[PDB]
């Protein structure tokens, strides 16, 4: 029960800092809480790991206060460095293994439609493009962070993310 | 018959990277992939340091509002047959964070491709500022994985509604 949380956290850290490939029932164990011969009897196939983490991993990951939280969540990703770099990580496998695909697609489109229902009740100006808008250009700016941080280098990325909210928000005919 | 069959090489490396990833590339894999699958890829490639540098370098090769809006929905239908590209990148930058040498070569390629893009904007007399160009390249970056990863998240989506808005918004200066 958090015997089986624990083993989700290690093979997080495992697709992070590894790999999909990287990711085996041998190096769960190394990594894990418990590194006896632990994972094999809590997961059937490791293709059942990949799917346990691909329904975990969003545990892990007016208009002025949408701008701040914006800005703070993309400041809070360094510390959950781990977290958006697995579900990198699980995005690519899932290409490869259908289950893993089916399982990831519902938790974010699941996870998307909330954040577009809660804006949409939020009184926030926008629509669904705002959302989706948002949704995909904080996801783009966490992963360039996160992976060639020097690209950014020269951005204002405070000054990027008020610019991008407050494009987003509008809503001209296009 | 030394930089053409180099390209090829680097083709079966791109095409290696996008079937297996990272991990699975390696020279063996590189051979049986290449068009010539004898043991070719040791001899061009002093290390697997400098075969993802290669790619990496060389990666971007196989990757009046109206014209701007139609361009990016033809982009992103270009994005099914470039699948193994934009795959093989995917593929680059998570390697990236593991070896330096790539992260370097792979920084470089994108900022570069990055400045030119805003400078282009930036003289081609369309409205918007570097905001325009950064936010574009990011929502279109994340949209091209989001189809090629997991399609079925997209799937209600109007993508060719969702990419004219972006660009239409995107434009618009307020002060912020």
Redesign the interface.
Known sequence: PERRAALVNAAIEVLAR?????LTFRAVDVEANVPKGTASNYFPSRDDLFDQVGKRIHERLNLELA?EYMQGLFGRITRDRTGY?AL??L??E??RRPEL??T??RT??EN?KRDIGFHLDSGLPGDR?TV??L???M???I??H???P??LEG?DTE??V???????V?T?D?
């Open positions: 590894e790999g999909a490939r990287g701008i770099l990198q990580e995005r690519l899932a290409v695909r089916t990831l697609t974010i489109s998307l493009s989706l808008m949704y995909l250009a996801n783009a700016l992963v360039e996160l992976t060639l020097g690209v951005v000054r990027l008020a610019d991008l909210v407050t494009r987003a509008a001209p296009a």
